[PDB]
Amino acid sequence: TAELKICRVNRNSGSCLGGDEIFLLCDKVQKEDIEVYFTGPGWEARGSFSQADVHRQVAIVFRTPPYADPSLQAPVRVSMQLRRPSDRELSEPMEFQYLPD
Amino acid sequence: TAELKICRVNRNSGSCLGGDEIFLLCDKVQKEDIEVYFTGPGWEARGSFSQADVHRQVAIVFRTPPYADPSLQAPVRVSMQLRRPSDRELSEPMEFQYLPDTDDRHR
């Protein structure tokens, strides 16, 4: 039922230390059944936010998670995706790059 | 405050030269009847965006207008509000701080 779609973001790169605030505009989602996933080879972490951070079901403001390597020497590419935990549905991925701090 | 309301923004400060991208979350608005109104003593300006920049009536991504003075030496706080042209309704004001900036091409 329904699909997940990332429409726009304020940024697609951030520090490998995590903690950057991201504004993500999306198609209708359910605040109690939604997450933001970051994935790379041998690594996965969720964006940090609460239900109050989901605005009118069409935008999520969250903080990026720390990357697996806190002392990056060059950019690394990971995928950012919306994920509905109930049915495991995933949105098409968006490129996100973690950078040296 | 009645119906127009700014709920959250990605940043509340930017260059006095304008052009900074702002993500503003708000209560329901009509894309063809809404604007972001900046004001200060004897100065007014509007944020720049297209109707396509209004996301599902509850979010606006816009570029800040340039402040009245590009020679700003110290930060200056101004007001930022949602404004509805049709009935001139205004949201409660949010503070925005313009910051000094330079352009090697402008003297």
Curated annotation (Swiss-Prot), chain B:
Highest taxon in the source lineage: Eukaryota
Residues with PTM Phosphothreonine: 64
Changes seen on gene knockout: RELA haploinsufficient mice show cutaneous ulceration, epidermal skin loss and a predominance of neutrophils and macrophages in the dermis and hypodermis in response to TNF treatment.
PTM comment text: Ubiquitinated by MKRN2, leading to its proteasomal degradation. Degradation is required for termination of NF-kappa-B response. Polyubiquitinated via 'Lys-29'-linked ubiquitin; leading to lysosomal degradation. Phosphorylation at Ser-86 by RPS6KA4 and RPS6KA5 promotes its transactivation and transcriptional activities.
Residue(s) carrying Phosphoserine: 86, 91
N6-acetyllysine modification, residue list: 28, 31
UniProt induction comment: Induced in myocardial tissue by lipopolysaccharide-induced myocarditis.
Tissue: Expressed in the myocardium (at protein level).
Reported effect, residue 91 to A/E: Abolishes DNA-binding and transcriptional activity
Compartments, as annotated in UniProt: Nucleus; Cytoplasm
Job description of the protein: NF-kappa-B is a pleiotropic transcription factor present in almost all cell types and is the endpoint of a series of signal transduction events that are initiated by a vast array of stimuli related to many biological processes such as inflammation, immunity, differentiation, cell growth, tumorigenesis and apoptosis. NF-kappa-B is a homo- or heterodimeric complex formed by the Rel-like domain-containing proteins RELA/p65, RELB, NFKB1/p105, NFKB1/p50, REL and NFKB2/p52. The heterodimeric RELA-NFKB1 complex appears to be most abundant one.
Complex and partners: Component of the NF-kappa-B p65-p50 complex. Component of the NF-kappa-B p65-c-Rel complex. Homodimer; component of the NF-kappa-B p65-p65 complex. Component of the NF-kappa-B p65-p52 complex. May interact with ETHE1. Binds TLE5 and TLE1. Interacts with TP53BP2. Binds to and is phosphorylated by the activated form of either RPS6KA4 or RPS6KA5. Interacts with ING4 and this interaction may be indirect. Interacts with CARM1, USP48 and UNC5CL. Interacts with IRAK1BP1. Interacts with NFKBIA. Interacts with GSK3B. Interacts with NFKBIB. Interacts with NFKBIE. Interacts with NFKBIZ.
Swiss-Prot/TrEMBL domain comment: The transcriptional activation domain 3/TA3 does not participate in the direct transcriptional activity of RELA but is involved in the control by RELA of the accessibility of target gene promoters. Mediates interaction with ZBTB7A.
Name of the molecule in the record: Transcription factor p65
Origin species: Mus musculus
